[PDB]
Amino acid sequence: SNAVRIEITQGVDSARPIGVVPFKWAGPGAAPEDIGGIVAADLRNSGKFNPLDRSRLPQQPATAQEVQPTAWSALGIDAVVVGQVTPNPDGSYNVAYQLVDTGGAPGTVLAQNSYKVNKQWLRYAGHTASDEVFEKLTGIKGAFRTRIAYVVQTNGGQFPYELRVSDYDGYNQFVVHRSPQPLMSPAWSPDGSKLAYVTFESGRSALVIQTLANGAVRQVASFPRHNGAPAFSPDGTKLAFALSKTGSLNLYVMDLASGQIRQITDGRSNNTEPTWFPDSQTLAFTSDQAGRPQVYKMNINGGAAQRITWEGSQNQDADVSSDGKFMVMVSSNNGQQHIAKQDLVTGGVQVLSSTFLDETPSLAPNGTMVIYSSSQGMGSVLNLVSTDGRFKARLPATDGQVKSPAWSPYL
Ligand SMILES: [K+]
Ligand code: NA
Numbered sequence: 001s002n003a004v005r006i007e008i009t010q011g012v013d014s015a016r017p018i019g020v021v022p023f024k025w026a027g028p029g030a031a032p033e034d035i036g037g038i039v040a041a042d043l044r045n046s047g048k049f050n051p052l053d054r055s056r057l058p059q060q061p062a063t064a065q066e067v068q069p070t071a072w073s074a075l076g077i078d079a080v081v082v083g084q085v086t087p088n089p090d091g092s093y094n095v096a097y098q099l100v101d102t103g104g105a106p107g108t109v110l111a112q113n114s115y116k117v118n119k120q121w122l123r124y125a126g127h128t129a130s131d132e133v134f135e136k137l138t139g140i141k142g143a144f145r146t147r148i149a150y151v152v153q154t155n156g157g158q159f160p161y162e163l164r165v166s167d168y169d170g171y172n173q174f175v176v177h178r179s180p181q182p183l184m185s186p187a188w189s190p191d192g193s194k195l196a197y198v199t200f201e202s203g204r205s206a207l208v209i210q211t212l213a214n215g216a217v218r219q220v221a222s223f224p225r226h227n228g229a230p231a232f233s234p235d236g237t238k239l240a241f242a243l244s245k246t247g248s249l250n251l252y253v254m255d256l257a258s259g260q261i262r263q264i265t266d267g268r269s270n271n272t273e274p275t276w277f278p279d280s281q282t283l284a285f286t287s288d289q290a291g292r293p294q295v296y297k298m299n300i301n302g303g304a305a306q307r308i309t310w311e312g313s314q315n316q317d318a319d320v321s322s323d324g325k326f327m328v329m330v331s332s333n334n335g336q337q338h339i340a341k342q343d344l345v346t347g348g349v350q351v352l353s354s355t356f357l358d359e360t361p362s363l364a365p366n367g368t369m370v371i372y373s374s375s376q377g378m379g380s381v382l383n384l385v386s387t388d389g390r391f392k393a394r395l396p397a398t399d400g401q402v403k404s405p406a407w408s409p410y411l
Contacts, residue, residue, distance in 0.1 A: 003152065003397045004170035004382060006045060010392035015050040016137070018043060019072050019102070022054065023083035023095070024062035031085060032119065035095055038126030039081055039133065042144040045169065045384075046134060046368065047391025052077060064098040069106035078103030079110065081133055085122075092118050095125035099133050111136040123171055143168060143364040147408040148371060149176070149186040149195055150382060152400040162400075163197055165212065168364075168407070170395070176210060185360075186406045187230045195406075196220070196230035196239060207241055220254055221261070229273045234322075235280035240264075240300075242272035251285060253300055264300050271296075271305075273317050278324045284308065286316040295329055295342075309342065311349045317360055320344075321367040328352070328361040328370050328387070339372050341387055352385045353392075362407040363387070371395070373403040 020040040025031035036054075043049035058071035061082050072080050083097035096114035100107065111132055115125040124145060131142030146168045154160050159178035163186060166173035177183060181200035188195060189209075196209045206222040207230055221227045223245040230241045239254045249270040254261045265271040269289030276283060277297075287296045287305065293316040295309040309315035314332035321327060324344065331340035331351065339353040339361045357375040364371070370385050380403040382395035396402070 001173045002166065002170040003164075003173055003399045004148070004150065004166055004395050004402060005398070006169055006384065006393050006395055008044070008391075008393045010390070011044075012047050012050070012386075012390045015044075015048060017075070017077045018049045018051050018133075018137075019057065019077045019080035020051045021057060021060050021062075021080065021082045023085050023097070025085050027085075027087040032093070033085070033122045033126070035083060035085055035097075035122070035126040035129065036081070038123060039083075039097070039130045041169065042127060042130035042142075043134060045144075045393070046142075047386040047388075048134070048138055048140075048368070064100050064107075064109050064112075067100045067102065067107065069100070069102035072102035073106070079133075079137060081129070083129065088116070092116055093122060093125070095122065095129065097129040097133070099136060123167065127167070140368060141366050141410065143366050143369065143407075143410070145411050146365060147192070147411065148382075149188065149406045149408070150373075150397075150402050151183045151186070151404040152397050152402050153182075153380075154400040160400075163195070165195070165408075176212065184404055185228050185230060186404060187232060188406055188408050189232045190234050190236050190409050192409050192411045194232075196232065196241075198228040198230070209239070221252070231274045231276055231283075233276050233280040234278055237280065238300075240274035240276065240283055242274065244270070251283065251298075264298070265305075275318045275320045275327070277320055278322065284318045284320050284327060286318070292332075295327070308344070309349075310347075311342075312340070315340070315342075319361055319363050321363055322365055323367060326367070326387070328363060330359055330361065339370055339385060341389075350389060352387070352389045353383065355383055355394075358383070360404055362405055364407050365410045369407075371405045371407050373405060375403070376401075 022036040040051035061067045080100045086094045098112040099110045117125045127144035130144040134142035152162045161179045163176040163183045184198040186197045205227040207220040207227045209218040226244040242249045249272045250265045273286040274283045292314040295318045296305040298305045312331045318327045318329040341350045355374040361370045361372040380401040384393040
């Protein structure tokens with residue numbers, strides 16, 4: 001199934017032109033998929049390419065040698081993707097692509113690969129070709145094999161809330177957990193094998209970690225009042241989260257090997273929404289110690305908290321990039337609530353989104369794209385915005401109200 005579907009609302013008119021030719025299907029009858037279409041959709045979804053419309057291709061070469069570079073260079077296109085899909089006698093498929101230069105080294109094969117995959121993984125093969133083309137031309141690792149987690153409120157009676165996972169483009173959706181009560185704040189382990197989330201099934205909040213492959217569930221915390229806002233450390237050793245049992249929200253860290261929980265804040269201010277820096281020892285977090293929520297930074301091993309958001313009436317729910325050079329967050333000014341980016345090297349802030357009641361932003365693992373949600377009151381949709389603010393897309397769920405996204409790590 002694929003309930004979440006990307007609808008581009010603001011394309012990048014000047015994005016790098018590229019030719020993506022339909023792949024040559026070697027079997028009988030109709031091709032099982034349209035791999036060239038997946039590659040073009042992935043490169044367009046990144047906000048960094050403008051694949052030529054299939055109806056305007058100057059030729060449809062089935063091999064690298066058939067590419068006529070002058071036909072593409074004449075259109076301002078300096079690279080062309082061609083490919084082949086062949087059924088194997090064992091019932092599997094070989095999905096091959098070649099990236100051909102049509103610029104300064106016309107006809108040269110810049111990159112190529114061939115993937116032996118079972119039917120279930122044909123989309124994954126297409127995404128692998130996209131990832132290689134994207135990285136070969138931009139020097140940035142591709143995110144097309146990644147997944148998203150999100151919560152859908154269906155129209156159903158007994159278990160209306162569903163924590164789900166899908167590919168980043170909505171395909172291959174599956175249900176992680178269904179509940180009569182709201183599910184909130186999913187967070188990925190860095191190896192992509194587990195999701196921490198908050199459940200209200202007992203009637204009050206409980207933080208749990210579910211292993212996706214086998215559905216195993218580990219209880220973390222169910223103390224009185226609020227338990228939530230989980231974040232896994234990048235090194236795989238710790239889970240940070242917030243508990244308000246002390247009359248005020250404090251940050252806690254659980255050592256995943258021992259299950260031991262340590263309290264790392266114990267002041268009067270509410271401290272919540274932890275997000276890790278790449279070192280697995282520094283956290284950004286939300287605090288009300290300056291009145292309206294702002295984002296602070298602290299080392300889990302001791303030392304004072306440092307305020308880092310000095311611009312704007314209110315800032316919260318941060319997500320620090322995988323490289324630690326910037327973060328995205330929810331910035332509120334003049335009654336407007338939008339996704340913003342703060343450069344942690346230059347200190348500057350840029351508002352990225354223009355939708356209504358924007359919340360819970362999550363960065364793709366290459367730092368190029370943000371997934372977030374926008375509340376409609378009763379309803380909700382997901383949205384995408386590039387970290388440079390030029391690309392925008394909306395991500396509604398066909399079967400319900402969707403919110404609380406989290407972008408997976410590289411898979
Ligand atoms: K506190
Ligand atoms: Na992050």
